[PDB]
Design a protein around this ligand. Structure first.
Ligand SMILES: O=[As]c1ccccc1
Ligand SMILES: [Ca+2]
Length: 234
């Protein structure tokens, strides 16, 4: 029944409170999502100062309920099934040869708006590493987000790696260890193993004079085989 909430365009609000090596910051975001296309469009602004980490490192932290699940995979969409009461999404993110983020978020409907509220804490970053040295290019790659059921927690375990392009031509890897658990007592869908295929585009708004990020994302689920009846259907 949660998926019925996503048949059209849904407004989104994102609120992040962060602390990285003691640098405190907050981010606010707004836009909309259209799960029929797996599409998200959002604008984020840094409320206080220049963001103390590079914008691309926050993309994953800043609503996988907007992924497009093809028809034959609808029974494996945990994210929508938990709505409207929502889910808790927690991550540890390990930046290779650098620090880590730990995040806890609640994703739920607040009226007709899908809201992602996050607390982020980062530690052990190197003052002249790629993160605190702001050596990441302002762009974003395509990824595979691997999802498995976690029966003990009535939720999911999610693991993937992000590749951040570095201005010297190298790559900064960020390994993501994620878990999601429903907030409500209602039944959820616990999926077979599968993955999301992602693509994100980062851009800027010349009229926005605050430090900011404009994001366009498309995400489709995959990794569950079509049955022969579906493959050969007329
Ligand atoms: As992979 C990727 C990056 C930019 C535009 C399209 C796809
Ligand atoms: Ca910069």
């Amino acid at each position: 029944k949660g998926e019925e909430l996503f048949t059209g365009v849904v407004p989104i609000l994102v609120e992040l409170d962060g602390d990285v090596n003691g640098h405190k910051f907050s981010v606010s975001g707004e836009g909309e999502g259209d799960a029929t296309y797996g599409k998200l469009t959002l604008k984020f602004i840094s409320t206080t100062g220049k963001l103390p980490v590079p914008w691309p490192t926050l993309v994953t932290t800043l609503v996988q309920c907007f992924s497009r699940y093809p028809d034959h995979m609808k029974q494996h969409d945990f994210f929508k099934s938990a709505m409207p009461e929502g889910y808790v999404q927690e991550r540890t993110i390990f930046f290779k040869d650098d620090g880590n983020y730990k995040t806890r978020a609640e994703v739920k409907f607040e009226g007709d708006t899908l809201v992602n509220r996050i607390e982020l804490k980062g530690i052990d970053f190197k003052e002249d590493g790629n993160i605190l040295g702001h050596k990441l290019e302002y762009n974003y790659n395509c990824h595979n987000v691997y999802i498995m059921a976690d029966k003990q927690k009535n939720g999911i375990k999610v693991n993937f790696k992000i590749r951040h392009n570095i201005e010297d031509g190298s790559v900064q890897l960020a390994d993501h260890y994620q878990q999601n658990t429903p907030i409500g007592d209602g039944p959820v869908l616990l999926p077979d193993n599968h993955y999301l295929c992602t693509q994100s585009a980062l851009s800027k708004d010349p009229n926005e004079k605050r430090d900011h990020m404009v994001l366009l994302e498309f995400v489709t689920a995959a990794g569950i085989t079509l049955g022969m009846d579906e493959l050969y259907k007329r």
